[PDB]
Structure formats: structure tokens, C-alpha cells
Symmetry: D2
Subunit: 116 residues, 4 copies
């Protein structure tokens, strides 16, 4: 799994379950092309977005649909989404974990990058 997303809820002290995530890759013409999408499991994890073959070099945007998450819980949050934008695989293949910790008016995000 070369790209995994993990989301935690700082209000509940739990995984953030059923969070929609959309990944985009910047195209040659500088537009954001849809790359992959999914939603977090009961563990707060999203696996299986892509493959080593398909996850080529590029600039990627991981959009975590935080507003949709909070609204589904009946809470009115501040942000539309959390965006994580990074160059990937430019020194060869790596494995990326994008983690996020959510509150209604705040979030934090980090990356764990490993070389297989």
C-alpha cells in the first residue's frame, strides 16, 4: 500500500469513521485530475487507494472531507476540508501515510514516509 490515510477525532477520542477522501494529481496542464477516492473504515483507516504501478511521480492533493464528516454527526464545523498537497515518488517509490486529527475548528496533519 503506497498511500494510506488515517483520521482521528479529537472530540470523541476515537477513529474518525466514514470520512470521505479524494486524491488528485496535478496534470501536465496544471489542472487537478481525479486520482483516487475512498472512505475511512471503522479503524479510521483508508487502504487500497492506489497501486505501486499507478502511483507515479507527481504532485498529489489528498482532500479529507472534514465538513461532510462533522455535518453527518450534526455539528457545524469551520473548514470545508483539509487538503494535504505534496510531491510524491520523486526519488523513487515511497510509502506514504497521511494522518489527520480533527476538531470542529481545527485540524492537524502529518506524513510518515518510508522507503520499502
Amino acid at each position: 500500500c503506497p498511500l494510506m490515510v488515517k483520521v482521528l477525532d479529537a472530540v470523541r477520542g476515537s477513529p474518525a469513521i466514514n470520512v470521505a477522501v479524494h486524491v488528485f494529481r496535478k496534470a501536465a496542464d496544471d489542472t487537478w485530475e481525479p486520482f483516487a477516492s475512498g472512505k475511512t473504515s471503522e479503524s479510521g483507516e483508508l487502504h487500497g487507494l492506489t497501486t505501486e504501478e499507478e502511483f507515479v511521480e507527481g504532485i498529489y492533493k489528498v482532500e479529507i472531507d472534514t465538513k461532510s464528516y462533522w455535518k453527518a454527526l450534526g455539528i457545524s464545523p469551520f473548514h470545508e476540508h483539509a487538503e494535504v498537497v505534496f510531491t510524491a515518488n520523486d526519488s523513487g517509490p515511497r510509502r506514504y501515510t497521511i494522518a489527520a486529527l480533527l476538531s470542529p475548528y481545527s485540524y492537524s496533519t502529518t506524513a510518515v514516509v518510508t522507503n520499502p
Copy 2:
């Protein structure tokens, strides 16, 4: 000052000085229209972006040029930039502070919305 941006550096324990910040407003066609920009001051703050008259309800994006910041300090960073996307809503308090706390592979952001 209806909109202020504050940026802090978690590596050095300091304000993040001379960071470029661009604000965009979402247009009807879903494109991002330039709105305001500037560079953070010696205190890590960017004041004077807009006025009450100009800062109408809508969706805004604050893009913080973190990559250039880290590179100017000789540090290799992960992100291209940090983004903060939110709706300005007149039913809530009137002053928005968007704060960001930067590390090479991570950032935190919060909103402080007051009257």
C-alpha cells in the same frame, strides 16, 4: 480587520517570518479568484488583507507558502503549501484569525473567530 493570518514555526520556536500568503475567493464557476496576499511580518502576522466592505460571505482559501519558507532556512519540507479552506458566515462572529503551526512534515491550523 476582518481577516488575519498568524504563522508559527515549531522547529525554531519562533514566529514564521516573511512567509508568503495568498487568499482566494471561490467564484460562481467554482474557480479560485485572487482576493488578498502578503508576507508575514516579524511577529508572524499578516494584517490588512481586506476590509469589512470587501469580505462578504463565501468560501475562501488561505494558501501559505510553507515550501519556500523551509527551503530559505535550509530545510527540506514535505508539503507544497498549506491550505486552509473555510466559509465566512455573517451569522457568526465578525473577526477571523487563521493560525498555522508549521513543521517540516506536519502542520496544525485553527480558527479563532471573535467579536
Copy 3:
């Protein structure tokens, strides 16, 4: 003002107002000696804790009473308090801001140390 404490609320998007804060200094016998205390203001800040004369090098602990804060808002929190433990060092910059960003099951803290 050599030491200031700032507290923000990540649930409401606001300063964290009327939060009790206690500062301790580590004594020679490794016990924590009361040093300064107060409650955060309407802006989430606590100024006036100490003076340059009193704030000598050493290990300090800033304890933020997060549990009472959340309970007063009707929210069940995880932590008993938030703690920030650090060394004041005269070789570095002279003004310390300890900032904390609170959620019910989480907190973030940073230091902004300037001249």
C-alpha cells in the same frame, strides 16, 4: 513580560477564557514550588505572571486546568490537566510564550521564544 500563556479552544474556535493556570519552579530537592498563577482573560491570555528579576534559569512547569474548562462548558474531557515542562535558558531569547490549543481528547502546545 518574560512569560505569557495563551490558550485556544479548537471546538468553539475561540480563546479559552477563564482557564486556571499554575506555574511551578523545580526546587533543588526535585519538588515543584509554586511560582505564579492566574486565569486567562477574554482573549485567552495570561500576562503578568512574573518579572525579569524573578524568572531565573531553571525548570518550570505550566499546568493548565483543562478539565474544569471543559466541564464548565458541559463537555466531558479526557485529561486531568495539560502540562508544559521546560527549561528557561538565558542563552536563548528573553520572552517566552507558551501556547496551547485544546480539544476534549487532545491538545497541542508550542513555544514562541523571542527577543
Copy 4:
């Protein structure tokens, strides 16, 4: 595993390996009694601190030795340690994950609490 600690490094984008962790429990006389200790693995995780039998109700302090971590990497950090203090198991047994994300002048921490 009723108590697990996980530590990530926000500078390197990696697990925080070899981080010492000391857990204390508040005694009847209000002192902090040593409860358990260990260090994070190559995954940034620390397992096996305690057992369901031993992890009774109480107020616990998880001290993550961040200064020692950063100093071993040759960096002069701000904090002495990160302390996480909480009441545990007061509504019956739970499983607690204490996570921390470290930078030289900052850290964040969260809890994931689950009911087995």
C-alpha cells in the same frame, strides 16, 4: 493491550524510535508511583506496558521523554518531556492509545479510547 503509546516525528516524517516512556499512577497519599515503562520500537509504538489485571482504576501519567529523544539525535529541544495525565478505567476497563507528534519546540497529543 490496554495501554499503548505511539510517537511520530514531525521533522523527519517518521516514527519516533527509541523514545523512553514512563507511566505513573497516583497513590492514595497523592504521590506519583512508578507503574510501568518502556521504549518505542522501530514502528514508533510501545506495547506491553501493562495487563488488564494490573491496569486498575486510577489517575495515570504517561511521561514521554522528548528531550532525551531529541538530544540523542543531537538537537537541543524546548520541553523536558510531554506529560499526558488522565483518569482511566473508571467506567470499567477500556483500551487506551496515547499518541504524540513531536517537533523540537512543540508537540501534540491525542487519545483513542475503545471499549472491548
